[PDB]
Enzyme design. Structure first.
Site, short mmCIF file in Angstrom:
data_model
loop_
_atom_site.label_atom_id
_atom_site.label_comp_id
_atom_site.label_asym_id
_atom_site.label_seq_id
_atom_site.Cartn_x
_atom_site.Cartn_y
_atom_site.Cartn_z
N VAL A 1 0.96 -1.44 0.11
CA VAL A 1 0.08 0.14 -0.46
C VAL A 1 0.62 1.50 -0.02
O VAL A 1 0.04 2.38 -0.41
CB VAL A 1 -1.19 0.06 0.84
CG1 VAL A 1 -1.98 1.06 1.22
CG2 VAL A 1 -2.05 -1.38 1.55
N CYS A 2 2.07 1.53 0.90
CA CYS A 2 2.75 2.30 0.62
C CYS A 2 4.00 3.21 0.13
O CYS A 2 4.02 4.45 0.11
CB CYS A 2 3.90 2.37 1.84
SG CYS A 2 2.66 3.24 3.83
N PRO A 3 4.24 2.46 -1.01
CA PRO A 3 5.76 3.08 -1.78
C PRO A 3 5.15 3.86 -2.54
O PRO A 3 5.82 4.69 -2.88
CB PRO A 3 5.98 1.53 -2.43
CG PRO A 3 4.95 0.99 -2.81
CD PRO A 3 3.57 0.89 -1.63
N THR A 4 3.85 4.22 -3.16
CA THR A 4 3.88 4.71 -4.09
C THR A 4 4.03 6.15 -3.57
O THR A 4 4.12 6.98 -4.21
CB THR A 4 2.58 4.31 -4.87
OG1 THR A 4 1.41 5.37 -4.80
CG2 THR A 4 1.82 2.70 -4.65
N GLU A 5 3.21 6.66 -2.75
CA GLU A 5 2.75 7.65 -1.33
C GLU A 5 4.36 8.49 -1.71
O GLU A 5 4.59 9.69 -2.07
CB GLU A 5 2.47 7.78 -0.23
CG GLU A 5 0.97 9.09 0.36
CD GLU A 5 0.90 9.37 1.26
OE1 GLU A 5 0.07 8.37 1.37
OE2 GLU A 5 1.75 10.34 2.60
#
Lengths: 162, 162, 162, 162, 162, 162, 162, 162, 162, 162, 162
Positions: E45-49
């Site tokens: 879930v986290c890496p894109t932000e």
């Protein structure tokens, strides 16, 4: 709108010649301005006093003073009145700008606006070249000002300023 | 203090003849009142305009109209000035009431009081028999009113009221 | 906040002319103060009583008494209400100061704050030149004070003090 | 008031259409709610951001989301502001509920209440159909939120929930 | 940790270039700091932000703003994730600091720590050159912030501060 | 305004010679100042006491002591009184400054201003070279001070000061 | 004892006609009660105001309102004063009940008792048929209430309740 | 404690003849009172001025005026000073009452009490038969009043009161 | 001020030889102090106990103990009493310090001040070289301590401390 | 618990003869009471001083004075100590009451209770027939009172009371 | 308040001639005082016994004894009763002081105050010149004292004191 303050800003369509023109307080920068209000166009009581100003208009120009009449009417009504011949209660040719205050906003800012019926009182302001009000007259609805007296006053402020 | 509302209440000591007298807005009930403000007694700029009213005073009484001048000075100062002969810058005999506004309250309530220096502007009110202000003039400190014009205006208001 | 003690201190922004000004209890040192509370601005029930004071304000001024109205609204709402023409339920020109009690702290200190809804009852305090409360009214929300009676009371206390 | 707990209960009078209506957190059961706080009515800084929401209001409705604005003002002040035309700094027609927090209690419970001055910070909460807060923004007093961004966020939480 | 107070102190090992480095709140004195929290490294879930901030990173430097990410992971996990190519879910080259909060203390002090599972919520704080928090977002675990919007806010606070 | 604190600041127009001059408390730094208030100009009760000081003026000068009188009157009123010959109730030649307190502010700061009528009490202050008040007299309106006694007092404070 | 709560209970001996009678708050259930306090019997300051109510007493009965005066004196004193002819300072015939508060208790409960001297302030309460206080006046010892105004207030609360 | 209000109440043990006597402000009802304060008994600076009054004591009695001296010492100190022969610094026989202000309360009430060292300033009050203060003097600690001047002043207030 | 705590600080003027001298609790560091209070100077009840200490004074010096008397009187009263020969009720030559507590502060801090009349009770404190109170007596005003017994106690505390 | 106030109430079980008996402050109405506190039973430091009182007990009775010793121990411990022969550190036959203060309440009320260890200081009070404390001694834990001196003091207070 | 202790202090306004006067216990220092209490003024049961004392008043004065009557009534009631002619139940001219105990405090202190109804019992005290009570009488409300018997008692106490 009181006597030593800067006159409230105004913008609005006026009937300048036979034409509509945007005019604002700034266009009178460095000039003496006699801003005066009257109730309504096409009223039996008003025309004589406005016409009087239109006549002596040049006397003011010589002494470096503009004269602009204003009322809450549309600038279209202003025209239609200019286009009425004096003969039948109209204004005829005019030598002073006729400012529309359709918005009631100008008469409100000069604190001359009867909110009840929604038209201005017979207020007059003498505003100097720096946009400072040096004089104000306010008359109830049915009573005209002396154009001569106002002229005397403009000159008098010029005197005392030199 | 605007054109169609009742004039603010005022009470205070005035120099009525050679004597002191309590006078209030109520004393002018059912009469026309020309209430007018001036800065200060014993100033080189004021006397001519006050004198002018003192002279034509009867003209006003005839059309049923009182005239009372006012300034922030003591009623003792008012007397002293009266007791200065016109010759040496004084006021001499006076036909109109000279009201003291020592507490600055009256000038305050007519909204003519320059709080800075603590003295009134040259404001003039025409108040009708019902205590309604029908006219107001305000001039900056150094400029006199036309007594003649004021009188014309009082008459004009009675005309339109009959 | 009881009759013979010094009125609690207060500070806060008021609409004094057309302008915001800080005012405190100390500003009324040496003068009589009629401090009065009302529920909320823009309520159909309040305006008539507030206007009533604004009109007779000069009467109070002459007898050395200030009048300041207060309610739990922001001074911004106060202005907005002043800027509403009386015609459409507003206050219009105001001759008394309109004090903002945003923090509800003033109404709390004078023990007129309904904690429930968070607005003041119709309390009125007459404070003398030494900061002593000489009189208090408190009415339930829907019922106005008589301005005339309040003036009579202010005068009365001055009588009995000389 | 933190992100994964139920939003604190609130009840209060809002201006729903042109009318006053009791609204509570329960009325938003099974809907998404964007509850957002602003300082005070009639402040020069606030109106643009509130208007912004009022406009895109429908966009939120479509994605099953209500929008209610709140501040510490009386619901009367709310109305008066709605009844001011956008032209002169007002809000004009409003498509979102305007909640009154007169008691300061709602702003207190959402932990956005500056106790000092007694008004709310620019807090925004996104509450899901089960009454769970999924997002909160808090800006210092002088800085507006992006309505577009808030909408994107509401959509995003729905996406991830299906 | 609320909006107008000083942001809580923090110290700890970050991954600054390819290197471990001690950083604390003080190193961001007189600079704008975007301090933001995320759950855990190596979550899908986290890496894109995070990557999104890394890219626009320079945009922030230009307006005099640092961006540091943080999460409850060891600074060794941080590095391992930097060293995972973006292709296979990693972070790749990073242009922002990655702060380790192994002790859970930083996330606790900023009030974003879910004590249950023992990781941070998606909190973001905008801290000005004086260490004062001007803005905060908190999102539930599965939803990303907009980098663009956060940059707009930073710019907005500088605007209003000049 | 009490005995061992600095005298409150004052600035105002005075009749210094025959001429108007700005005077403040600073102009009396390093000298003994006898500041004294009287009710009004041109009152029958006041002149003898003022004259009294005017005579012995030099005695004070000798002991390094200024004497300024003050009242709520305009500096014009002051001049006019000076220009009245003693014969007919006036002041005549004046050896002491006559300070105008038009704003009532000075009388307000020394706490001698009866706000009701709006004039001063017969207050006297002896202020030393360091601007500390060492003595104050206050008499009710109708009773004069002894100049002789005031002079002795001034000498006295000097005696004790070395 | 404040405005919207029930008025505290009270029992005590009054002078009802020429006769002593036990009266309590209950006896006024379903009626309007004007309960008012005064300092002491046989004081030169009190009688006029009390008389004033006795006279208009009927006016109150007509609108369904009782009037009972109260003070800390024995009911024997009350009688004695009723039995003094108005001519020599007394009360004479009385149309209202005169309640004795010998124990100082009733005045204590209505929070009008000055403990120092042990007498009541000039408090007035308007209680409705349900025992709820709608209005309170409290004046310092030397100043009378207007009977007319109190009558107007009673009427007004009835109006608003129908 | 200022000029036209009632002198604060005072009670306390004085040394009246050679004897202790309770005296209060009430004892001087319908008489003139010169209440004057001095620092401490047995100080080298004080005795001459107290003696001066004790001498002219009769002169005051004639014009119906009492004189009481007061300081913060015990009435026992008072007596011991009276029992010291003038020869060795004492006061000797005394024609005026010497009031003890052990509690510092009287000196506080008259606002002459230096809280620092705990002793009074050299204040003097002239109080009329109604308990009204007509005159006050306050000298710093080391400087005596003129008894003659004070006498003149008492007479002067009687003159103007008949 | 209780037994095992440090004795409250005190400073003030004492009569040490025939001279005034500043003394404070610190001057008795590392010495035993018998600090004792008495009502008032020149009272018929006090002198015999004070004199008793003065005599045995040296006995205390030998065991390394100072004895200072104290009372609410000025240090001028103190001297005057020293200078009264024992024959006629005075103190005569004194071998202990006589401390002035003009401000009543010392007696307040030791909790021996009767606030009513404003004098001290007959308190005595034994303070050891560390400023710790080991013993206290308090007697009602009319009854003396035994000097012999107090000396025995001082000795006793030194014994038990070696 | 200070010198001129009524001694705090106390009730508790004492060892009166060889027997337990309830005793309270009331039992000593109209008698002089020497109430004195000691730390603990069975301590090596205490017994001599208690015994001392037990011996001279009759001397006190003669002058109409009771003596009761008190400590925080159970009345059972009291008995056990009485039942220890003096030979082996005990008390033996006792002529004074031994009061138990098991609840620490009496020592608390007399303000002699060291809360730390939970035992009393060596306090002694002389209470007159009206329950007024005329004298108090407090010694630190390890130092005995003089029974002779205490007796002298009781006599002395009787002397001065007749 | 019992037989051989000092009479409790009392202060309060009395009707001494036809005038109000502050009186306290001290005023009777060195004289005998017969202080006696009665229920209420204007009761049918009281007057004969008060009158009785007023008559024999001088008999008391001869034997150096004052007589002051006291009840819980205001000193205004006291006057009104004096000003009622004996003929119609009044008191007429009075030769003893009539003390007001409005605060119920004096009757409380003397322990004659029935707290229930809030009035005094018929208590009488004979106080000697040192302020010691030598006799007391208390009768239930409806029964009068013998003035003769009380006079015999005063004389008897003087006899036995010489």
């Amino acid at each position: 709108p009181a006597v030593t303050q800067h006159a409230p800003y105004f913008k609005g369509t006026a009937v300048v010649s036979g034409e509509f023109k945007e005019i604002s307080l700034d266009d009178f920068k460095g000039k003496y301005l006699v801003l005066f209000f009257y109730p309504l166009d096409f009223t039996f009581v008003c025309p004589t006093e406005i016409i009087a100003f239109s006549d002596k208009a040049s006397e003011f120009h010589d002494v470096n003073c503009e004269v602009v009449a204003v009322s809450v009417d549309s600038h279209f009504s202003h025209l239609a009145w200019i286009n009425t011949p004096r003969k039948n209660g109209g204004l005829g040719h005019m030598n002073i700008a006729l400012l529309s205050d359709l918005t009631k906003q100008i008469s409100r800012d000069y604190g001359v606006l009867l909110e009840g019926p929604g038209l201005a009182l017979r207020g007059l302001f003498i505003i100097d070249p720096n946009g400072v009000i040096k004089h104000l007259s306010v008359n109830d609805l049915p009573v005209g000002r002396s154009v001569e007296e106002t002229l005397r006053l403009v000159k008098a402020f010029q005197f005392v300023e030199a």
